[PDB]
Design a protein around this motif. Structure first.
Motif, short mmCIF file in Angstrom:
data_model
loop_
_atom_site.label_atom_id
_atom_site.label_comp_id
_atom_site.label_asym_id
_atom_site.label_seq_id
_atom_site.Cartn_x
_atom_site.Cartn_y
_atom_site.Cartn_z
N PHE A 1 -11.49 -2.79 -4.27
CA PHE A 1 -12.15 -3.92 -3.63
C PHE A 1 -13.41 -3.48 -2.83
O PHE A 1 -14.36 -4.23 -2.72
N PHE A 2 -13.37 -2.27 -2.28
CA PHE A 2 -14.47 -1.72 -1.50
C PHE A 2 -15.32 -0.71 -2.26
O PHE A 2 -16.20 -0.07 -1.68
N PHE B 1 -17.65 -1.11 -4.60
CA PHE B 1 -19.00 -1.51 -4.97
C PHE B 1 -19.43 -2.69 -4.12
O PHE B 1 -18.59 -3.39 -3.54
N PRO B 2 -20.74 -2.95 -4.07
CA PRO B 2 -21.19 -4.05 -3.20
C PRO B 2 -20.64 -5.42 -3.55
O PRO B 2 -20.52 -5.77 -4.73
N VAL B 3 -20.33 -6.22 -2.53
CA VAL B 3 -19.90 -7.61 -2.74
C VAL B 3 -21.09 -8.48 -3.17
O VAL B 3 -22.13 -8.49 -2.52
N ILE C 1 -19.25 -13.53 -6.40
CA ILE C 1 -17.81 -13.41 -6.13
C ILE C 1 -17.47 -13.97 -4.75
O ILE C 1 -16.35 -14.42 -4.51
N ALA C 2 -18.44 -13.93 -3.84
CA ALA C 2 -18.23 -14.33 -2.44
C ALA C 2 -19.38 -15.21 -1.99
O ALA C 2 -20.38 -14.73 -1.48
N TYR D 1 -22.19 -14.72 0.92
CA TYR D 1 -21.89 -13.44 1.56
C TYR D 1 -23.14 -12.82 2.21
O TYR D 1 -23.11 -12.38 3.37
N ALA E 1 -15.77 -7.05 6.12
CA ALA E 1 -14.63 -7.73 5.48
C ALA E 1 -13.88 -8.60 6.49
O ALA E 1 -13.39 -9.68 6.16
N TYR F 1 -16.39 -11.89 7.13
CA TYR F 1 -16.55 -12.91 6.10
C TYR F 1 -15.24 -13.59 5.74
O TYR F 1 -15.20 -14.81 5.56
N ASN F 2 -14.19 -12.79 5.63
CA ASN F 2 -12.86 -13.25 5.29
C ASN F 2 -12.08 -13.66 6.53
O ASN F 2 -12.33 -13.17 7.63
N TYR G 1 -8.36 -9.12 1.69
CA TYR G 1 -9.47 -8.22 2.07
C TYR G 1 -9.51 -7.90 3.57
O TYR G 1 -9.78 -6.78 3.96
C1 LIG Z 1 -17.57 -5.01 -8.26
N1 LIG Z 1 -16.59 -5.43 -7.24
C2 LIG Z 1 -17.26 -5.90 -6.03
C3 LIG Z 1 -16.25 -6.14 -4.92
C4 LIG Z 1 -15.00 -6.85 -5.40
C5 LIG Z 1 -14.78 -7.03 -6.77
C6 LIG Z 1 -13.62 -7.67 -7.20
C7 LIG Z 1 -12.68 -8.13 -6.29
C8 LIG Z 1 -12.88 -7.94 -4.94
C9 LIG Z 1 -14.05 -7.33 -4.49
N2 LIG Z 1 -14.27 -7.17 -3.10
C10 LIG Z 1 -14.51 -8.18 -2.22
C11 LIG Z 1 -14.79 -9.50 -2.69
N3 LIG Z 1 -15.04 -10.52 -1.93
N4 LIG Z 1 -15.05 -10.33 -0.58
C12 LIG Z 1 -15.37 -11.52 0.20
C13 LIG Z 1 -14.83 -9.14 0.07
O1 LIG Z 1 -14.86 -9.08 1.29
C14 LIG Z 1 -14.55 -8.04 -0.83
CL1 LIG Z 1 -14.22 -6.50 -0.10
C15 LIG Z 1 -15.76 -6.51 -7.79
#
Ligand SMILES: CN1CCc2c(cccc2Nc2cnn(C)c(=O)c2Cl)C1
Ligand SMILES: CN1CCc2c(cccc2Nc2cnn(C)c(=O)c2Cl)C1
Length: 101
Positions: free
Chosen positions: A23-24, A26-28, A32-33, A36, A75, A78-79, A85
Protein backbone atom coordinates in the motif's frame (compact mmCIF):
# COMPACT_ATOMS: atom_id res chain seq x y z
CA UNK A 1 27.22 3.14 -1.66
CA UNK A 2 28.20 5.11 1.46
CA UNK A 3 27.69 3.81 5.02
CA UNK A 4 24.55 5.95 5.44
CA UNK A 5 23.15 4.65 2.11
CA UNK A 6 23.77 1.05 3.20
CA UNK A 7 22.11 1.58 6.62
CA UNK A 8 19.10 3.30 5.06
CA UNK A 9 18.70 0.52 2.45
CA UNK A 10 18.64 -1.95 5.37
CA UNK A 11 16.01 0.04 7.27
CA UNK A 12 13.88 0.48 4.13
CA UNK A 13 13.91 -3.27 3.41
CA UNK A 14 12.77 -3.97 6.98
CA UNK A 15 10.10 -1.24 6.88
CA UNK A 16 8.67 -2.52 3.61
CA UNK A 17 8.31 -6.03 5.09
CA UNK A 18 5.72 -4.44 7.41
CA UNK A 19 3.58 -3.49 4.37
CA UNK A 20 3.05 -6.81 2.59
CA UNK A 21 0.24 -5.44 0.33
CA UNK A 22 2.59 -2.67 -0.81
CA UNK A 23 0.00 0.00 0.00
CA UNK A 24 2.98 2.33 0.71
CA UNK A 25 5.22 1.02 -2.09
CA UNK A 26 4.36 3.72 -4.65
CA UNK A 27 2.79 7.18 -4.77
CA UNK A 28 -0.95 7.53 -4.12
CA UNK A 29 -2.83 8.76 -7.22
CA UNK A 30 -5.94 10.94 -7.22
CA UNK A 31 -7.52 8.22 -9.38
CA UNK A 32 -7.35 5.73 -6.44
CA UNK A 33 -7.81 8.44 -3.79
CA UNK A 34 -10.02 11.29 -4.97
CA UNK A 35 -8.66 14.72 -4.06
CA UNK A 36 -5.52 13.26 -2.48
CA UNK A 37 -3.10 15.79 -4.03
CA UNK A 38 -5.34 18.66 -2.86
CA UNK A 39 -5.41 17.36 0.75
CA UNK A 40 -1.80 16.15 1.07
CA UNK A 41 0.79 18.88 0.38
CA UNK A 42 3.89 16.73 0.62
CA UNK A 43 3.32 13.17 -0.59
CA UNK A 44 5.71 10.40 0.33
CA UNK A 45 6.04 6.65 -0.23
CA UNK A 46 8.69 3.91 0.08
CA UNK A 47 9.51 4.03 -3.66
CA UNK A 48 10.33 7.73 -3.50
CA UNK A 49 12.36 6.99 -0.36
CA UNK A 50 14.33 4.31 -2.22
CA UNK A 51 15.09 6.76 -5.04
CA UNK A 52 16.24 9.36 -2.50
CA UNK A 53 18.63 6.83 -0.91
CA UNK A 54 20.09 5.85 -4.29
CA UNK A 55 20.40 9.53 -5.30
CA UNK A 56 22.22 10.13 -1.96
CA UNK A 57 19.62 12.71 -0.88
CA UNK A 58 19.59 11.63 2.82
CA UNK A 59 22.63 12.71 4.89
CA UNK A 60 21.27 11.50 8.25
CA UNK A 61 19.03 8.85 9.76
CA UNK A 62 16.92 11.74 11.16
CA UNK A 63 16.12 12.89 7.60
CA UNK A 64 15.14 9.39 6.55
CA UNK A 65 12.90 8.93 9.62
CA UNK A 66 11.17 12.30 8.85
CA UNK A 67 10.19 11.02 5.39
CA UNK A 68 8.92 7.78 6.93
CA UNK A 69 6.85 9.75 9.44
CA UNK A 70 5.60 12.10 6.67
CA UNK A 71 4.34 9.06 4.70
CA UNK A 72 2.53 7.70 7.76
CA UNK A 73 1.14 11.11 8.74
CA UNK A 74 -0.20 11.57 5.24
CA UNK A 75 -2.15 8.27 5.55
CA UNK A 76 -3.47 9.37 8.93
CA UNK A 77 -4.57 12.71 7.46
CA UNK A 78 -6.39 11.65 4.31
CA UNK A 79 -7.94 8.47 5.68
CA UNK A 80 -10.34 8.21 8.60
CA UNK A 81 -9.33 6.47 11.87
CA UNK A 82 -11.55 3.40 11.22
CA UNK A 83 -9.72 2.39 8.09
CA UNK A 84 -7.09 -0.06 6.78
CA UNK A 85 -4.50 2.53 5.61
CA UNK A 86 -4.85 4.65 8.78
CA UNK A 87 -4.40 1.64 11.09
CA UNK A 88 -1.44 0.27 9.11
CA UNK A 89 0.20 3.70 8.94
CA UNK A 90 -0.10 4.13 12.72
CA UNK A 91 1.15 0.58 13.37
CA UNK A 92 4.21 0.78 11.13
CA UNK A 93 5.07 4.32 12.32
CA UNK A 94 5.53 3.08 15.88
CA UNK A 95 7.19 -0.23 14.93
CA UNK A 96 9.45 1.42 12.36
CA UNK A 97 10.63 4.17 14.73
CA UNK A 98 11.34 1.53 17.39
CA UNK A 99 13.16 -0.58 14.81
CA UNK A 100 15.36 2.43 13.82
CA UNK A 101 15.94 3.11 17.56
C1 LIG B 1 0.37 1.80 -6.97
N1 LIG B 1 -0.28 1.76 -5.64
C2 LIG B 1 -0.41 3.11 -5.09
C3 LIG B 1 -0.89 3.06 -3.64
C4 LIG B 1 -1.99 2.04 -3.43
C5 LIG B 1 -2.33 1.14 -4.44
C6 LIG B 1 -3.33 0.20 -4.22
C7 LIG B 1 -4.00 0.14 -3.01
C8 LIG B 1 -3.66 1.02 -1.99
C9 LIG B 1 -2.68 1.98 -2.20
N2 LIG B 1 -2.36 2.90 -1.17
C10 LIG B 1 -3.17 3.89 -0.72
C11 LIG B 1 -4.36 4.23 -1.43
N3 LIG B 1 -5.19 5.16 -1.09
N4 LIG B 1 -4.91 5.89 0.03
C12 LIG B 1 -5.88 6.94 0.34
C13 LIG B 1 -3.81 5.74 0.84
O1 LIG B 1 -3.66 6.44 1.82
C14 LIG B 1 -2.93 4.68 0.41
CL1 LIG B 1 -1.52 4.38 1.38
C15 LIG B 1 -1.60 1.15 -5.76
C1 LIG C 1 22.99 -4.56 17.88
N1 LIG C 1 22.24 -3.71 16.94
C2 LIG C 1 22.80 -2.36 16.92
C3 LIG C 1 21.90 -1.43 16.13
C4 LIG C 1 21.47 -2.03 14.81
C5 LIG C 1 21.68 -3.39 14.55
C6 LIG C 1 21.28 -3.92 13.33
C7 LIG C 1 20.68 -3.13 12.37
C8 LIG C 1 20.46 -1.78 12.61
C9 LIG C 1 20.86 -1.23 13.83
N2 LIG C 1 20.64 0.15 14.11
C10 LIG C 1 21.41 1.23 13.84
C11 LIG C 1 22.70 1.09 13.21
N3 LIG C 1 23.49 2.08 12.94
N4 LIG C 1 23.09 3.34 13.25
C12 LIG C 1 24.04 4.39 12.89
C13 LIG C 1 21.90 3.68 13.84
O1 LIG C 1 21.62 4.85 14.08
C14 LIG C 1 21.05 2.54 14.14
CL1 LIG C 1 19.53 2.86 14.89
C15 LIG C 1 22.32 -4.28 15.58
Amino acid sequence: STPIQQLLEHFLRQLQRKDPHGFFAFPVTDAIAPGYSMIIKHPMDFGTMKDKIVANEYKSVTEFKADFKLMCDNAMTYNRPDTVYYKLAKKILHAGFKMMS
